[PDB]
Amino acid sequence: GSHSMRYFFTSVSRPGRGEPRFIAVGYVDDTQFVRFDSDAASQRMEPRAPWIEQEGPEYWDGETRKVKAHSQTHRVDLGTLRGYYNQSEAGSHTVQRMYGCDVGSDWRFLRGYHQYAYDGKDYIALKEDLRSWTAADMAAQTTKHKWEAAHVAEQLRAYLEGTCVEWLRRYLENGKETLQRTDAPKTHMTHHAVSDHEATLRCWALSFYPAEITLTWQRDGEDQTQDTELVETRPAGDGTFQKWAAVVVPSGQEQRYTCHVQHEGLPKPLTLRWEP
Amino acid sequence: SLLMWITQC
C-alpha cells in the first residue's frame, strides 16, 4: 500500500512567559517516530518508534540542530506575522507547518506537501503539484514574494521529491517489522436493549494498523445510514487503532442488518451479523 | 529526516 512521511510543527507564542513553545513530531504512515519539545529537558530530537533508534549520533545531532534551527525560524515568524496583521505582543498566536511526501505501493513519489497556517487558518501552501504557491491574503502575499525571490519552492521540492522520499524508503526498510506490518482488525458485535421496541447493534474493529478502515451497515442487503453512529478512528495507545459503527434496529429484526469491514490487513472484507 | 533550510515568512 501507499506510504507517507510527515513532519508537524507547532509554535505557540506565550506573551511574557518566556520563549514560544515549539513542538515537532514526525510520522511515517500512522506511526510517530520522533519528537522535539522546546520545554522538555533533553533539548534533543528524541526517538518515539523503535526502528529509528538504529540511526547513529550523527543523525541525532543533525536532526537536533535542524529542529532547533526550525524552532528559531518559527519564533521569528511569530513576531513577523504579528507585525503583518498588526496584532499585539500580549496575545498568544499559533503557527503550524506540515511538510512531507507520499509514495505509492511501489514506493515511487506520488506527491509532496508544504503547508503553513497562522492561528488555525491556511496562510501559505505549496499547490498540489508543488509548482506554485497559494497565498491566503496580503500578509501571505508578502511572504509569497519573499519566498519566490529566494526560490524557496524549488528548495522545498528538491527535498520533497528526493531527500524526503529517500529517507521514507530508508525508514520503511529499517522498520519493516512494524511499518510494513498489517494488523487486520479484531472484530466483534455487541447488542443492547434500548427500549420496548429498539435494540442497538455495535460493530467493533480493534487492534488494527494502519488506521485507514471502512465500517458500513446494510439492512436487507442495502446500505444503511438511518439511526446509525460511526466514531472517528482512534488510537488504542499501543500503536494500533480502534473504530466502531452502531445502528438502532427494531427489536426482533437484528439479523436483517450486517456490518461490513474493509481493511488492508484483510484478504477479504469481513461481514458481521448478530448471532445470539 | 528534516528539511535543513527554512526561510522566514
Epitope: 533539548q43 534551527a69 528559531q72 526560490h151 | 522566514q8
Partner: T-cell receptor
C-alpha cells in the same frame, strides 16, 4: 548589519575578555572565527538558535552563549599569546540565501 | 562527502585592463549556496556575490559569478581589471544536507592588478 566590539584590544596573559557581536537582522545563525595574519578563517563556535551552540574547528580556550537572537559573545577564558589573532563574527539566515554577513573584525594581541 | 573547496589560481599577478577568471571548485555538490568575498591585507571580508543552485548567476559591476553546469564548480569573472581589485578573493559554500550549516572556505586567490 553585524557589529563587533571591541575592534582592537591588548590583553595580558591570563586575562579574561569578552568580544561582543550583535546583529539586527533576526539571523538564526551566528558564528565566530579567528584568522591569524596570512592564514585562513578557522571556526571557533557557532549557534543556530537561542541556547544552542556548537564547536567549530578551534573551540579550546573559548566560550560562547546565545541568550538572545541578536547577540553571540565570545569569551576568552584565560588569554594566552597563542590567542593573538583577528576575530570575526558572521551571521546569516538559516534559509533565504544563507548569505554570510561578517563583522568588521577584532584584532586582539595577548602579551606577557 | 566531507566538503573540500579548492581555488585556482592561488595567486594572480596581471596588468590592469585584463579580463580575469577565478575558479572555485568543491567536492560535495550538495550545496545550499556559494559566496564570494574579497579580503584586503589587515582588513575584513567584503561579500561580493552570492549564488545558489536555483539562482546560478549574479552580477555586480565588473564582477559576475556563475555556478557551472558541472555541479561542483563556480567561476568568478572580473572584467577590465583595475588596481583597486587587488585583494584575496575567497569563496565559501554552505551545506545543503549535513545538518551542520558550517561553511567551507577555500584558501583564496591572491590577486594583484598592476597599474
Amino acid at each position: 548589519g553585524v557589529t563587533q566590539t571591541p575592534k582592537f584590544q591588548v590583553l595580558k596573559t591570563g586575562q579574561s575578555m569578552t568580544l561582543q557581536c550583535a546583529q539586527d537582522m533576526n539571523h538564526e545563525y551566528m558564528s565566530w572565527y579567528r584568522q591569524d595574519p596570512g592564514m585562513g578563517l578557522r571556526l571557533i563556535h557557532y549557534s543556530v538558535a537561542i541556547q544552542t551552540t556548537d564547536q567549530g574547528e578551534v573551540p579550546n580556550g573559548y566560550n560562547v552563549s546565545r541568550s538572545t537572537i541578536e547577540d553571540f559573545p565570545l569569551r576568552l577564558l584565560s588569554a594566552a599569546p597563542s590567542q593573538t589573532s583577528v576575530y570575526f563574527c558572521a551571521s546569516s539566515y538559516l534559509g533565504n540565501t544563507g548569505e554570510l554577513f561578517f563583522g568588521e573584525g577584532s584584532r586582539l594581541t595577548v602579551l606577557e | 562527502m566531507k566538503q573540500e573547496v579548492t581555488q585556482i589560481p592561488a595567486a594572480l599577478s596581471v596588468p590592469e585592463g585584463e579580463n580575469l577568471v577565478l575558479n572555485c571548485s568543491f567536492t560535495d555538490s550538495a550545496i545550499y549556496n556559494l559566496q564570494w568575498f574579497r579580503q584586503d591585507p589587515g582588513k575584513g571580508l567584503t561579500s561580493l556575490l552570492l549564488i545558489t543552485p536555483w539562482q546560478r548567476e549574479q552580477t555586480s559591476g565588473r564582477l559576475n559569478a556563475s555556478l557551472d553546469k558541472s555541479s561542483g564548480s563556480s567561476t568568478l569573472y572580473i572584467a577590465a581589471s583595475q588596481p583597486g581589485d587587488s585583494a584575496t578573493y575567497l569563496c565559501a559554500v554552505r551545506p545543503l544536507l549535513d545538518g551542520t550549516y558550517i561553511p567551507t572556505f577555500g584558501r583564496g586567490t591572491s590577486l594583484i592588478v598592476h597599474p
